[PDB]
């Protein structure tokens, strides 16, 4: 039953991807879309019927060599069941949404066929993420890890005739490879310290790992801290965390349905999930968690400021995902992994809707993506307006301040902000400030597109119309999650310590549970006991950013233009996204190309070949010319040589003496 969920999407993708010609494009699209829905139902049944006893379903042996063994296997615990409904639900919806969004594409000429290929890529992308989240060992986690990398590269560069898409997909693969470099070094370290790559066997040995010193490069390190850091470098790349983030903004070059799947279900959630799946190790690594928070909190702030000034609709939502994933890393760092998963689960719902909502706008607006040309549109697109509004409500966290009643992201974000206060003063303050910036760019997105004077070319504006039901029903189903999901799962994830324990079926060896929390950790409790000025600050900052957005676009709409002129250097800094790309091109790309040409022409050509050719073709021919010259043809010279030979040999015999 679990195997069907895992392997059905792969089989559908193979049939649709390679054999759509035999069975036609339409049968291929329905095969992938239909098979996803069936797995989504099986995922929900697995999720709502889980009794709390993790299951281990073996499939095949992958790599066996001496004492090293990793297997194709399926583990089903609370974490796996959670990720199942998140992956399959959003993937199933994205397949349905794609049936209309890609119905007639302007990127391709009518000769070219793309519909069957696109749906095969989505099914395989689903397969890779499913393989990642059901992993029983660190190696299979890597396969899915690299699997989403190649599926994303296929989909981010779906429009292979667009040089911008081909560069963007290439960038995503390379940057995520930089993350996989640390991941791999963590896997090597774990195997040699514990003799296994299986999660349970690793967790059993974690307490000794915390007291272990491991040599690595120039010094010895606490094993747990080093390994936690090395595995986190992988999570930073996959979740587009700070310093490994530049690939996510450019993933917009792909189709809009791909952005939703990357940003809410498959790619970015992998990093947080790894942190939560590997919590039995991060609980015994005090210093690794410290670094997770600083990265997590700085990313939330960094990605919030950049979203303030971006003008492309998807790139605003692109940075929102990075900032939102900042929050979930703070929660795991402070030691509350249920809250990290809680926000991950709720984030999947309203983030998918926001992207599927923005696809409708782009689809309706004749595929224009610059918000500067998006005025009005509220009456022209009724349902997309409200779905986007609900998405804004959830991400901003519109609720009743001191109660436990509101949209999805209201509850989950408050849990993280409460935990941040108990866990790190650095974390708590950056998050609320980011929470203030979140409200501005979220509502700035609404006012620019769904309000004001119809702004930009009237042709599309007049022709604007609501997209067909196939693109709106998935939005509707998502809305049923971006309102009730937070209230539905608050208790089991964050509400009561006993409630959280049984849900996750959690010094004793940190094994048997979906997550682990060290006994000395009480941040979850201290979050509940936190004062009231903590529990209301998110509502205050959210409102505060809202009023600025209202003040900046409805009333006195010239304030946004004037302020940049007052502080212009700070306008460029945000607009250029803090210049990270330019720094990398200077420090990594250009030097690497220059280094290769120097080694190619200077090393191989001038030093190594220059020497070899210099001897083979310079020296030996020079000795040949001397030999030819000495063969003068004069008889008296040849006799001289014979006499020199005898005289030299006689000198040799004389030095040895009579004896």
């Amino acid at each position: 039953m679990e195997k069907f969920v895992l392997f059905a999407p792969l089989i559908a993708s193979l049939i649709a991807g390679l054999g759509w010609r035999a069975i036609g494009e339409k049968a291929a699209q329905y095969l992938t879309t239909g098979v996803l829905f069936l797995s989504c139902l099986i995922s929900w049944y697995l999720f709502l019927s889980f009794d709390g006893v993790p299951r281990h379903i073996p499939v095949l042996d992958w790599v066996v060599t001496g004492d090293f063994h990793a297997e194709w296997a399926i583990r089903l615990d609370r974490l796996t069941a959670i990720m199942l409904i998140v992956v399959t639900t959003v993937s199933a919806l994205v397949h349905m949404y794609s049936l209309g969004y890609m119905a007639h594409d302007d990127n391709w000429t009518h000769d070219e066929h793309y519909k069957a290929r696109f749906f095969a890529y989505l099914s395989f992308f689903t397969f890779a993420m499913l393989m990642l989240v059901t992993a029983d060992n660190l190696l299979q986690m890597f396969f899915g890890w690299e699997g989403v990398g190649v599926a994303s590269y296929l989909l981010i560069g779906f429009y292979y005739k667009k040089a911008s898409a081909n560069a963007a997909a290439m960038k995503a693969f390379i940057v995520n490879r930089v993350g996989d470099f640390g991941f791999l070094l963590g896997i090597f370290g774990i195997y040699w310290l514990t003799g296994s790559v299986q999660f349970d066997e690793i967790f059993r040995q974690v307490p000794q790992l915390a007291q272990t010193e491991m040599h690595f490069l120039w010094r010895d390190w606490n094993a747990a801290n080093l390994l936690g850091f090395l595995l986190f470098v992988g999570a930073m790349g996959k979740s587009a965390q700070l310093l490994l983030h530049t690939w996510l903004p450019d993933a917009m070059e792909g189709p809009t349905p791909v952005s939703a799947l990357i940003h809410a279900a498959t790619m970015v959630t992998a990093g947080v999930f790894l942190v939560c799946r590997m919590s039995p190790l991060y609980e015994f690594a005090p210093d690794a968690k410290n670094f997770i928070v600083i990265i997590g909190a700085t990313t939330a702030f960094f990605a919030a400021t950049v979203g303030l000034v971006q003008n492309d609709i998807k790139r605003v939502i692109a940075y929102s995902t990075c900032s939102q994933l900042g929050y979930m890393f703070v929660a795991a760092g402070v030691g509350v992994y249920s809250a990290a998963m809680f926000h991950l689960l709720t984030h999947a719902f309203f983030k998918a809707m926001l992207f599927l909502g923005a696809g409708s706008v782009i689809h309706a607006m004749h595929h224009e993506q610059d918000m500067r040309n998006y005025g009005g549109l509220r009456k022209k697109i009724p349902l997309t307006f409200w779905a986007m509004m609900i998405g804004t409500f959830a991400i901003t966290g519109v609720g009743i301040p001191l109660t436990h009643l509101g949209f999805a992201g209201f509850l989950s974000k408050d849990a993280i902000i409460e935990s941040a206060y108990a866990g790190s003063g650095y974390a708590f303050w950056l998050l609320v400030i980011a929470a203030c910036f979140t409200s501005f760019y979220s509502w700035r997105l609404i006012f620019l597109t769904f309000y004001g004077k119809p702004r930009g070319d009237h042709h599309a504006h007049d022709h604007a119309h609501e997209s067909p039901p196939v693109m709106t029903i998935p939005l509707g189903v998502l809305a049923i999650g971006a309102v009730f999901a937070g209230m539905v799962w608050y208790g089991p994830f964050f509400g009561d310590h006993h409630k959280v324990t049984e849900y996750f079926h959690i010094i004793a060896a940190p094994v048997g549970g979906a997550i682990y929390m060290h006994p000395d950790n009480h941040i979850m409790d201290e979050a509940h006991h936190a004062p009231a000025w903590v529990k209301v600050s998110p509502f205050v900052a959210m409102v505060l950013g809202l009023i600025t957005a209202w003040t900046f676009y409805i009333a006195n709409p010239s304030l946004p233009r004037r302020l940049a002129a007052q502080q212009p250097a700070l306008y460029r800094f945000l607009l250029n996204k803090w210049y990270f790309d330019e720094i990398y091109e200077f420090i990594f790309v250009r030097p690497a190309k220059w280094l290769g040409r120097v080694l190619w022409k200077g090393g191989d050509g001038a030093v190594i070949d220059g020497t070899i050719n210099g001897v083979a073709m310079g020296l030996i021919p020079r000795l040949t010319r001397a030999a030819v010259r000495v063969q003068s043809g004069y008889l008296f010279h040849y006799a001289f040589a014979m006499v020199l030979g005898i005289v030299g040999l006689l000198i040799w015999v004389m030095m040895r003496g009579a004896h």
């Binding site: 095949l60 042996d61 992958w62 790599v63 066996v64 060599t65 001496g66 004492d67 090293f68 194709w72 890597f142 396969f143 690299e146 699997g147 190649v150 560069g157 292979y160 005739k161 040089a163 081909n166 290439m170 693969f173 390379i174 490879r177 930089v178 996989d180 470099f181 791999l184 070094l185 896997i187 090597f188 370290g189 195997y191 040699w192 040599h215 690595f216 490069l217 690497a592 190309k593 280094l595 290769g596 040409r597 080694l599 190619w600 090393g603 191989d604 190594i608 070949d609 070899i612 083979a616």
Partner: protein
């Protein structure tokens, strides 16, 4: 069925002699006969070598299928296989039928082309079956002759220089190994490889010229063999023959040059350097580690700078062999198993990539990257195949490329973390040059009149690739098909290496 190794070794050579004698005519029908005769011969050799593969017993770490006869000058003709060398026989016989099938459109001196490949196969197989020290050297060096002519007659515009550099560079390194083989022959009084595997060559230090020779006689013998296998592998910096020979050879020549002949250097390390000179190998481990780490980084950056598509693939091979060298000299079960897997895996992937170059070389007669672009628009099947092997070339999990890379890196980590960190960066660098080459050649718009009418892969071309895609995926998903065979033999090899280390 008692001389199976002799049959698979000399059957291709005998067929070449028959073809040279009893095949007449230079018209297309005469050429058409030569291609069919070669294809049936290579297919026959592969089928017979499957009997070896399936009768082979992995649990037995001794030599199987052994045949021994008297020979000249007091030597013996002895052949056999074990878990370390059986798979290199099957790889050779597997690539040969596919390589023949890819030459089906060659019209220039076809009968002579087929003879050179048939002779080359027999000599390549002998390298892996020989169990006599001199017999190994005979097949090891005899292979230079047909390859010298394959590059010279059918190569590119620089083939005269490439063929001479290939022969003389390789010849220079192996003559030093010949003198070491004569010395081992005199010390042990035998050329029997099984007997030399248990002999203890002296390792007590002595002084030679102005330096101490750490490792004594073993180090001197080790260095002679290292010179031969380092150039053959090739290792950095003795690699600069490969970007000439592999590039200037005909496509079929490049396939066998990269898929098979490179493996003779790595197999040499597993057959001789580690078993017969363990003390010297332990001493040389630090230097081999950094030469191999340098090779991965150095040639990965050099590949990124190439303007010539075939040269990118050529330089890629040198990086991939860097993993093999590290894995061998990590001298633990994980590293050595990864090294053998990496060698076999690189055979399918590198060969396939050289066939991908030939597909578009045949149509356009150029190797400049900038002469292509947007080929996906006219060549959908090619872009899919080229993409698959591009991804295998960057060690993507699920393809056989990942397994060999992963295990050699983890075996080295156990010994040296600095080396493993530098070598592991190849995953970042391999993706860089491999993806950039694929993008610049296959993706984009078709904006050149020359490429406007380009055709897609023909059915024969598609069928050459399908076996290579199968092996890459099968071994990527089920590598146990390889490690079950090599497991027990590597375990015994690793154990002897440990028991010989100085105490």
């Amino acid at each position: 069925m008692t001389n199976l190794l002799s049959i698979i070794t000399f059957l291709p050579i005998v067929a070449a002699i028959i073809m040279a004698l009893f095949l007449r005519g230079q018209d297309e029908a005469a050429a058409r006969n030569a291609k069919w005769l070669a294809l049936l011969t290579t297919t026959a050799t592969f089928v017979i070598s499957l009997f070896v593969l399936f009768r082979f017993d992995p649990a037995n770490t001794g030599f199987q299928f052994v045949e021994d006869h008297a020979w000249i000058m007091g030597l013996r003709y002895k052949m056999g296989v074990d878990g370390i060398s059986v798979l290199f026989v099957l790889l050779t016989t597997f690539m040969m039928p596919l390589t023949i099938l890819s030459t089906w459109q060659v019209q220039d001196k076809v009968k002579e082309y087929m003879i050179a490949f048939l002779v080359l196969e027999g000599l390549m197989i002998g390298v892996f079956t020989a169990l006599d020290l001199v017999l190994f050297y005979l097949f090891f060096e005899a292979g230079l002759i047909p390859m010298f002519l394959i590059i010279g007659i059918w190569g590119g515009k620089d083939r005269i220089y490439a063929s001479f550099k290939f022969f003389l560079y390789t010849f220079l390194g192996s003559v030093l190994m010949l003198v070491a083989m004569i010395a081992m022959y005199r010390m042990a009084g035998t050329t029997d490889i099984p007997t030399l595997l248990t002999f203890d060559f002296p390792s007590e230090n002595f002084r030679l010229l102005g330096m101490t020779v750490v490792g004594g006689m073993q180090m001197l013998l080790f260095l002679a063999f290292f010179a031969s296998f380092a150039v053959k592998m090739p290792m950095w910096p003795v690699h600069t023959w490969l970007p000439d020979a592999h590039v200037q050879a005909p496509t079929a020549g490049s396939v066998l040059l990269a898929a098979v002949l490179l493996k003779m250097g790595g197999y040499g390390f597993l057959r001789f350097s580690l078993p017969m000179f363990p003390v010297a190998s332990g001493v040389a481990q630090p230097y081999v580690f950094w030469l191999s780490a340098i090779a991965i980084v150095y040639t990965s950056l050099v590949a990124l700078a190439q303007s010539d598509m075939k040269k990118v693939i050529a330089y890629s091979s040198v990086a991939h062999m860097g993993y093999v060298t590290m894995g061998v000299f990590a001298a633990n079960q994980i590293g050595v198993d990864g090294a053998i897997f990496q060698m076999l895996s690189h055979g399918f992937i590198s060969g396939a990539l050289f066939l991908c170059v030939g597909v578009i070389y045949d149509r356009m007669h150029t190797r400049e990257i900038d002469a292509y672009g947007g080929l996906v628009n006219r060549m959908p099947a090619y872009a899919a195949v080229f993409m698959f092997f591009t991804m295998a070339n960057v060690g993507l999990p699920g393809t056989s490329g990942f397994v060999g890379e992963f295990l050699t890196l983890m075996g080295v980590f156990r010994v040296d973390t600095w080396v493993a960190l530098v070598a592991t960066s190849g995953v970042i660098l391999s993706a860089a040059y491999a993806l950039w080459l694929y993008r610049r050649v296959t993706l984009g718009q078709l904006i050149k009149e020359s490429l406007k009418s380009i055709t897609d892969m023909t059915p024969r071309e598609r069928w050459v690739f399908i076996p290579l895609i199968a092996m890459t995926l099968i071994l990527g998903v089920y590598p146990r098909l390889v490690t079950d065979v090599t497991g027990p033999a590597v375990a015994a090899l690793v154990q002897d290496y440990n028991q010989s280390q100085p105490a």
